Design a protein around this ligand. Structure first.
Ligand SMILES: N#Cc1cn([C@@H]2O[C@H](CO)[C@@H](O)[C@H]2O)c2ncnc(N)c12
Length: 252
C-alpha cells in the first residue's frame, strides 16, 4: 500500500527535498510499477529517477538518468497506468490481431507495441526518441530536451512558431510522415501539435497507437493525420494543400 510505495521511493532515491515529485510518484504509480522500476534500477538501466514530466489519463512520463549502450543517457521513462477506447488500434494491427489480448496483459502488450513502433520508425529514419528498453508497463527512451527539461511540443511553442522557420518545421513534419509511411510502413494515427516536439528539428512521440499499412483503417488514419497537421500549421501562416501533401507522403 503506502508503506510498499515509500520503500520503493526510498530505494529509487526519490526524496521529499526534490519538490512535489515524491508526492506525485506515490499517487500516480502503484506498487507493481514501482517494483518494475526498481528492477530496472538494480539491473543497472536506471541510475536515478528524476522530475515528473507529465501526468495523464493513460500514461505518466518521468525524467531519469540511466545507462544504455554502456553510456550514461538522459531518459524519458514513459509508464502506462495498469488500468479501453484504444482497441481499434490494437486489434486490426496484424502484429497483434492473432494474439491473446488478455485483460491483465493488455497494457503490457500496448507498451510493447509502442516500443516496437519506436524501433521501426527510428530504424526507417523517422525522428522519434531512441528507444532503449521496456519492461511490463515501463518504457525507457531517449530524453528529448536538455538539462532535464523537455523540448516544447508544437502547441507549447504556439505563437513562438512565428518567430521560427514555421514553414521549415512544417516540411520537417511532412518529411517524417513520408518516411513513416514509405520506409517504416506505419501510420502514426494520432499525429498532432500535442505529440510533435521541437529541438533543432521535429521528433514524433506517443507511438503506442501507430498501425502498419496493412491495418484496414491505415489510409483513413493517414489522411486524418495530414488534415490535422495542415490545419494546425494554417494558424501560423503555412499555406499547404491537402492533395499535394497526401500524394507527397504516399509517393504519388
Ligand atoms: N514519449 C515521450 C515523451 C513525452 N514527453 C513529455 O510528456 C508529455 C506527454 O507527451 C509531452 O508534452 C512531453 O512534454 C517527453 N519528454 C521528453 N522526452 C521524451 N521522450 C518524452
Amino acid at each position: 500500500d503506502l508503506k510498499k510505495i515509500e520503500s520503493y521511493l526510498d530505494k529509487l532515491r526519490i526524496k521529499e527535498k526534490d519538490g512535489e515529485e515524491r508526492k506525485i510518484y506515490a499517487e500516480v504509480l502503484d506498487g507493481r510499477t514501482l517494483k518494475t522500476l526498481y528492477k530496472l534500477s538494480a539491473k543497472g538501466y536506471i541510475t536515478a529517477m528524476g522530475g515528473v514530466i507529465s501526468t495523464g489519463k493513460e500514461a505518466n512520463v518521468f525524467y531519469a538518468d540511466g545507462v544504455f549502450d554502456g553510456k550514461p543517457v538522459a531518459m524519458a521513462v514513459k509508464i502506462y497506468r495498469i488500468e479501453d477506447k484504444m482497441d481499434e488500434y490494437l486489434y486490426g494491427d496484424e502484429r497483434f490481431d492473432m494474439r491473446r489480448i488478455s485483460p491483465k496483459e493488455k497494457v503490457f502488450i500496448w507498451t510493447e507495441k509502442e516500443f516496437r513502433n519506436l524501433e521501426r520508425a527510428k530504424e526507417a529514419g523517422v525522428s522519434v526518441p531512441q528507444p532503449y528498453t521496456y519492461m511490463k508497463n515501463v518504457l525507457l527512451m531517449e530524453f528529448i530536451g536538455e538539462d532535464e527539461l523537455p523540448a516544447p511540443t508544437l502547441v507549447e511553442l504556439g505563437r513562438e512558431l512565428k518567430e521560427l522557420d514555421v514553414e521549415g518545421i512544417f516540411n520537417d513534419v511532412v518529411e517524417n510522415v513520408k518516411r513513416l509511411y514509405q520506409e517504416a510502413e506505419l501510420v502514426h494515427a494520432d499525429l498532432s501539435e500535442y505529440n510533435i516536439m521541437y529541438i533543432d528539428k521535429v521528433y514524433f512521440i506517443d507511438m503506442g497507437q501507430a498501425v502498419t499499412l496493412r491495418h484496414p483503417m491505415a489510409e483513413s488514419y493517414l489522411e486524418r493525420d495530414v488534415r490535422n497537421i495542415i490545419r494546425f500549421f494554417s494558424k501560423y501562416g503555412v499555406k499547404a494543400d491537402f492533395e499535394e501533401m497526401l500524394k507527397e507522403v504516399k509517393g504519388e
